Design a protein around this ligand. Sequence first.
Ligand SMILES: [Mg+2]
Ligand SMILES: [Mg+2]
Lengths: 388, 388
Amino acid sequence: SVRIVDVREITKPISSPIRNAYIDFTKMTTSLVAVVTDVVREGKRVVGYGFNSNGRYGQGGLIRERFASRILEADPKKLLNEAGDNLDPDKVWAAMMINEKPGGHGERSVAVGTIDMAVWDAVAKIAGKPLFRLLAERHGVKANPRVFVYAAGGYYYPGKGLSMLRGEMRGYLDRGYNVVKMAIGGAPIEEDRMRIEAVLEEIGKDAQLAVDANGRFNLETGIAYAKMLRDYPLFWYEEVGDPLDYALQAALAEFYPGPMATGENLFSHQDARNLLRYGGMRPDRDWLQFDCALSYGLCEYQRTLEVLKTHGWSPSRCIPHGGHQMSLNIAAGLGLGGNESYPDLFQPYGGFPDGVRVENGHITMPDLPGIGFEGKSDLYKEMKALAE
Amino acid sequence: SVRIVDVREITKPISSPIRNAYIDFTKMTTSLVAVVTDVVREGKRVVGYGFNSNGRYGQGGLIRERFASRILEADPKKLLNEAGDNLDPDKVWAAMMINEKPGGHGERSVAVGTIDMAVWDAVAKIAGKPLFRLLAERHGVKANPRVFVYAAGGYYYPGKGLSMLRGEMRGYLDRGYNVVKMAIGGAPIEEDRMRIEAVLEEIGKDAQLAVDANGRFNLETGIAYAKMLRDYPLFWYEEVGDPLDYALQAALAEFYPGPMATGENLFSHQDARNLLRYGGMRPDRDWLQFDCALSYGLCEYQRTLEVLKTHGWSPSRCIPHGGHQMSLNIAAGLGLGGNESYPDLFQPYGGFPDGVRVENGHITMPDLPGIGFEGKSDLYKEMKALAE
Ligand SMILES: [Mg+2]
Ligand SMILES: [Mg+2]
């Protein structure tokens, strides 16, 4: 007997006055979800957990009012795999997606992606395997526990000056990171130049710098920043214009030969397909940042990887946004290019298991069952408080 | 003094076992919203009302947790027009859109669009004008109260046969409609052919038939249906494939010269822009069905009309999905091609003021202040029950 006995949710705050070119995180929240089963492993009830990434807010209402109910109301026998000894993630996905009209991929994509995370967590636990190894198995590939991670921060903050910006970055380098990201477009172009040079000077030859415009720029502004930016050895220029203005992105290739990245705000394989079709991105050097937690989960992310193949892209071009363990498992299991990380933000959500250190921009996935949340005490404390 | 004193919401059920190619309306709901102002004329305070269209579900949670609060917390003086004698819809729009990241246009687009509807309703009432006339004024154009409307139905229903389908359609013709729409793709292609011929025979020369696939078809199926459909004198072929698969839509032009329609499931001007850029639709005969109530409202719809102009399209190509009075006002005020109508569904939401009859596919907008909800007793009853 294998069945989902309950789906609990609790909205947690991850707010602060940090600000980027488009938004400030003054009221930012996230949904912590628990998928409770009636299965037991390692002498404890198996409970899958999940939470959504920063930026799109918690989805308690949708989870309760539309998706959780469908799962709990579904015939338990129709959510199992071939052998009937575990849950089939895709069947659970399909079950919660009934009566949902096409298009409109936002908000509900976060609710579903967060539940999906907890479902895969439970499935892996029931199978007694680390999620990344279960994924490698299902895809017939060899997993690689060594995953590249970069530190994201450099936000605009009330009273935060250049010296403080430099300190923040040095703080990331002190922790083993060799690639850092900062926000831009939240100040006059010449002020951002100063912020960039300050950071560039601080990290010297020990790390590379990536900048994020958060989709705030129109074509002309995007080009203006491109001309200023291309004179520096940046790791990448992220989300220059509106995430859906593919023509704008395509036009940037003419002014910015260096690597660019985007995708965190595209939440479906259909939207990702359109990015690959009309975005004009360079598959040899650009980065795709789709976030499964905000995009209907891993079940959907697999369809997105299928889209990349149809368009001749390599999964190694993917570096998910979000800084969460779900992405780490996908990266390690399916060969993504790496994962984002927020060493000083949104804690305890995200991060790594207690003990794993970042060495030369890389961490090594320990063999913990499921996603590995249990290994991060301050996070797991929050989770077992929700359901155990 | 002009200020929004409260924003109330109540989720109403508009469910039934009707089914289309993609979804069934078993759990369908809608949010009824009231924007209460401190403006009282003759011991009667002005209250704006709004509700979202069928298909995307109610958004009580989002409205309460994210948007209403921003409006109520905003400085009342910063939401007024130049003269400070009325609310500025765009300022209210901007106020509720703060701290919202780009992309992900779904769900929140419905919440905002529903509040927006109530805001414009209140603004027009405060100005003492029918919304459509206020719109014509703001755009410097002449309003036209005669609006084209078509009856939408023909859903798959348990135990509903051809005879019953025929009766449904005759029922619409009896009420003055000369264009009817039915769902397709919810049965084998040859069964749908039978349903189509049945309806075609029933309406004879008194009306034209439109078919809706609800975005269920893949390219090959879309083409197969196109070959079958093009042999009949259909009014239009709606949403053939996924609303975001623009390439699929473009490819259909080769097999279906007759008019096609889509757009109900695109909820932003950015998404509409992409449809015009990559959809390959014929601006001389196709129809755009964007629904302001599901797309961030009229404030956003105006930006969408701007997008149509930038791409050489005429607003007369627009026939909003949803069957609601907000669209009727926009159609009459800005010259859209007409509006959808559900004579037998989702009542009392949608419809026309008590007394206005559909004659030869057209209704004539009476000069009621605001949207004109007060003129439809069964609907207004529900509204004043929410707030008065
Ligand atoms: Mg970013
Ligand atoms: Mg339709």
